[PDB]
Write a protein that binds this DNA or RNA. Structure first.
Lengths: 53, 54
DNA sequence: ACATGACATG
DNA sequence: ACATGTCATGT
């Protein structure tokens, strides 16, 4: 991850979520990701994905 | 308005950049489970992820 | 590049 | 009210 030559750019993920859900993600971002919400969203999505398989 | 009084919550925008590989995975899940509705797949996935945390 | 939203079509 | 995308502005 992070910066390096040829690294593929990220793609826009845009969706509507419940207020409570977005708030949990924001709190999580402030405590673990330096308030970077999109970073927090990826970590949580990754955690959600391994629960699928 | 009405639905509001009974607890129906208006959804809010979550906009973030994701690695192309992860999006392909959210999309494959949307295909298998939500009739390709990526937003709905993202909610279900995010919820499972949040359930870990707390 | 990336992070956030405001615009902008179906 | 949703779903998805592209612009635009400040990092």
């Amino acid at each position: 991850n992070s910066v390096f030559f040829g690294k593929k750019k990220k793609v826009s993920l845009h969706l509507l979520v419940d207020p409570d859900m977005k708030d949990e993600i924001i709190k999580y971002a402030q405590e673990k990701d330096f308030d970077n919400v999109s970073q927090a969203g990826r970590e949580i999505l990754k955690k959600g994905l391994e629960q699928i398989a």
